[PDB]
Design a protein around this ligand. Structure first.
Ligand SMILES: CCCOC(=O)N1CCN(C(=O)c2ccc3cc4c(nc3c2)C[C@H](CN)CC4)[C@@H](C)C1
Ligand SMILES: C[S@@+](CC[C@H](N)C(=O)[O-])C[C@H]1O[C@@H](n2cnc3c(N)ncnc32)[C@H](O)[C@@H]1O
Ligand SMILES: [Zn+2]
Ligand SMILES: [Zn+2]
Ligand SMILES: [Zn+2]
Length: 423
């Protein structure tokens, strides 16, 4: 029996609402993707199927584009890769945009696969497209995506007979724009993109009552506040380290709606997020585009070099509560962790702790993972009482946001017992 249900909202299209009272941490829905693929920066870095990292990946011999962590992953992924393999091969060395490879797997899954469990509450055909709200510039971009799809898929799709009935590629890409799920690994690094049509019923809130976490390509939807019967379920579509101005632009450009919530009306936390000299965090925000680009490609040495030039600059510096300064600290922490610079990683990580408590209120999986990384670093140093405090705080958050069904919770339990035995 489902604890959620689809309903027609008053002004947000369709949505999800509770059929029973919900408590923080309660599992509401589980879903594998209808279709998913590794994102551009993690291609060749994580396994195409399980989205886990590895030093040595084996490649598909036919296309040499798909890469896997094991023979089990390569063989199990063959049915959903067989038809895209001929297309990736014949289009070498041109790799398509992530959304184009995603839509190709949607078509193959819809044409050759049994009805997907991911479409139980809501199908790909049901997905919102926002067609009558798209700007002319957006339409032109979609038309280029359509022609990109036709060029990349010509080996396997020649006409509409190879597409599902009444399938419009323009409308399909419009659905992808506002229904794609960025997939992050356990360490909160973006590794993939997928479509989860039942989950696509969740509308947005800048202060939501639900939250999702990814365990590989598997999606877990949990409540993070108390929810009563009939109350709409909401998740936050956006990164928490954004101003209401930045939220307005992305919700307009990507999702075609204006947010009326209390946070956007009052510019909640905007002033604290932009403390420090404006000229400085304008330049830091500029450098962040290259920093986050390099991190998306796992170039940790180059990330750390750019972050140190900001964190330990000779010129004017920013408070750690400034979001762009905070983002540089987070990038520098993750770089040092992957480079084995654990003392320097703890220094940056501990500095993010108080701003993260402010900007990730309640139970948020991003803060839970961040607190776990800091506690794990402190445990390796021998700072046992400080490590336990954070590891228990991480568990307080992640028992709500991740739950028993997420494997990272098992990793945290092992850290908790090892450091508890230490104390
Ligand atoms: C139909 C679209 C649904 O709405 C959305 O786009 N969401 C709602 C649900 N979600 C997540 O929980 C979600 C999934 C992966 C994430 C990976 C990272 C971060 N945060 C994430 C949030 C923040 C980190 C900050 N360094 C970077 C890594 C995303 C897919 C966005
Ligand atoms: C992932 S879908 C959510 C479900 C959608 N309402 C539907 O009927 O399929 C995202 C779309 O829902 C609408 N939406 C989401 N959150 C909203 C909100 N807070 N206010 C108004 N519309 C919203 C926007 O049109 C957005 O493009
Ligand atoms: Zn794998
Ligand atoms: Zn292949
Ligand atoms: Zn809002």
């Amino acid at each position: 029996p489902l604890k959620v249900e689809k309903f027609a909202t008053a002004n947000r299209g369709n949505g999800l609402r509770a059929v029973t009272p919900l408590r923080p941490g309660e599992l509401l829905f589980r879903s594998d993707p209808l279709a998913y693929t590794v994102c551009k920066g993690s291609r060749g870095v994580v396994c195409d199927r399980c989205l886990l990292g590895k030093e040595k990946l084996m490649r598909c011999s036919q296309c040499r584009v798909a890469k896997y962590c094991s023979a089990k992953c390569q063989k199990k992924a063959w049915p959903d890769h067989k038809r895209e393999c001929k297309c990736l091969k014949s289009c070498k060395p041109r790799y398509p945009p992530d959304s184009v490879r995603l839509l190709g797997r949607v078509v193959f899954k819809l044409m050759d696969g049994a009805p997907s469990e991911s479409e139980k509450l809501y199908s790909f055909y049901d997905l919102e497209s926002n067609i009558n709200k798209l700007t002319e510039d957006r339409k032109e971009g979609l038309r280029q995506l359509v022609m990109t799809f036709q060029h990349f898929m010509r080996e396997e799709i020649q006409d509409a007979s190879q597409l599902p009935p009444a399938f419009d590629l323009f409308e399909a890409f419009a659905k992808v724009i506002c229904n794609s799920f960025t997939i992050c690994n356990a360490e909160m690094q973006e590794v993939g993109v997928g479509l989860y049509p039942s989950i696509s019923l969740l509308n947005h809130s800048c202060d939501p009552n639900c939250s999702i976490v990814f365990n590989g390509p598997h999606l877990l939807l949990r409540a993070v506040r108390d929810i009563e019967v009939g109350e709409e379920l909401t998740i936050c579509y956006l990164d928490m380290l954004m101003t209401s101005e930045e939220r307005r632009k992305q919700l307009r450009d990507q999702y075609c709606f204006e947010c009326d919530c209390f946070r956007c009306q009052t510019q909640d936390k905007d002033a604290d997020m932009l403390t420090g000299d404006e000229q400085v965090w304008k330049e830091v925000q500029e450098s962040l585009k290259k920093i986050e680009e390099l991190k998306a490609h796992w170039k940790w040495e180059q990330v750390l070099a750019m972050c140190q030039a900001i964190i330990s600059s000779n010129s004017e510096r920013l408070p750690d509560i400034n979001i762009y300064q905070l983002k540089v600290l987070d990038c520098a922490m993750d770089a040092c962790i992957n480079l084995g610079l654990l003392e320097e990683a703890l220094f940056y990580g501990t500095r993010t702790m108080e701003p993260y408590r402010i900007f990730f209120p309640g139970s948020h999986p991003v803060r839970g993972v961040q607190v776990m990384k800091v506690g794990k670093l402190q445990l390796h140093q021998g700072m046992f009482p400080q490590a336990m405090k954070n590891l228990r705080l991480a568990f307080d958050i992640m028992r709500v946001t991740h739950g028993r069904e997420h494997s990272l919770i098992e990793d945290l339990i092992l850290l908790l017992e090892e450091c508890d035995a230490n104390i």
